[PDB]
Ligand binder design. Sequence first.
Ligand SMILES: [Zn+2]
Ligand SMILES: [Zn+2]
Ligand SMILES: [Zn+2]
Ligand SMILES: [Zn+2]
Ligand SMILES: [Zn+2]
Lengths: 115, 113, 115, 117
Amino acid sequence: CPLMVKVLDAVRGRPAVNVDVKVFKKTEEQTWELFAAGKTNDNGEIHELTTDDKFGEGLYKVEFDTISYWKALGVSPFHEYADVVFTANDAGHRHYTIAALLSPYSFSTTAIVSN
Amino acid sequence: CPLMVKVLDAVRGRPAVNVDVKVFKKTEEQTWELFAAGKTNDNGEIHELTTDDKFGEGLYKVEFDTISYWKALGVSPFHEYADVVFTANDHRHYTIAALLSPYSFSTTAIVSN
Amino acid sequence: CPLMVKVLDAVRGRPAVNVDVKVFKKTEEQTWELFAAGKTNDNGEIHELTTDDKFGEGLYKVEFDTISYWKALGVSPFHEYADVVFTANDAGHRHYTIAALLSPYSFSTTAIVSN
Amino acid sequence: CPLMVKVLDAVRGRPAVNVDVKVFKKTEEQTWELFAAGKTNDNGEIHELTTDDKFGEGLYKVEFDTISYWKALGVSPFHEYADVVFTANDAGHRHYTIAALLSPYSFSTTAIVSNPT
Ligand SMILES: [Zn+2]
Ligand SMILES: [Zn+2]
Ligand SMILES: [Zn+2]
Ligand SMILES: [Zn+2]
Ligand SMILES: [Zn+2]
């Protein structure tokens, strides 16, 4: 599984469950085309997402729908969403885990890249 | 000054100097239109990014060009760039703080009156 | 396994391997007594730090030896070490994961608590 | 001013006001002696914490009382407190800002170190 996410909620000290996650890929026309999608499970992870075959070289954007996550818990957050944009698989085959730590007015995102 | 940025480098423990920062604003055509731009100074701040008059209600995107920042220091980082998107319903002042590491990016919003 | 750690290196985008982790527990005499110790593996995890039986109610301190970690990579960091202090198991039995993200001049810590 | 703190609350997007802060310094006897203390103001800063004269070489610990901060806002937090320990002024005279970002189950800290030339 070459693209994973792990989302944690810094307010509750729990994985963030039901965070809608879209992955886009940049096209020759310089637009973002929807590549993959899911919802974080009980562990704040998205199983599947894509495959070594269908992945490939290019520029990807992983978007977490943070505003819906917070609003559903009665919190009024700052950000519309949290993006991670990066070039993938251009210097040999890697696996990417995108970790996101969520607070209402703050976010962090960290990439773990393996071989 | 109603929209500020403060950028820190977590590797050096110094403000991040010369980080290209673009601010966009969402339009009725559903596109991002360039609204403001600058480069962080010696304190990692951009000084007069916009003005109370020009900065109305709407949806804004602050973009930090992190890949250039790092590459120029001989580091090969993870992110192409780092976006902060939010709706200003202001009257309020917004500081976007970013902490930069090669494989991690952290952002906090400070909102005042 | 009721007390886990997960340590990531924000410079390399890799789990932080060989970080010395000591766990202390507060005593009646108001001192810290050494409770457990380990070194992060290839995934930045310590695997069996204590056990449900030995890990009771009280005040604990998890210490990461960050200065040795960085110096060994030729970096001269800011912090001597990074501590996480917390009360555990006082409102019923929980499992605790302490996540740390390391940069030379910055450290971040998050707790994940489950039932 | 050679030692500042700046404390932010990640839940509110506001400076964290009235965070109790203590600074300790390590002694020859291997113990922590209280060196300075304050409460964060409206900007989450404590300013005149110490002075270039009083603040020499050594090992210091800056402690934020996060549990009181949160409890006073009705939040039951995870950490008892948050410590930042570091050696200061051993390679020439510097100024230190310790920035802390607080969430109920998460704590983040960054050091900004400058050379007053
Ligand atoms: Zn593979
Ligand atoms: Zn876009
Ligand atoms: Zn158990
Ligand atoms: Zn101690
Ligand atoms: Zn001085």
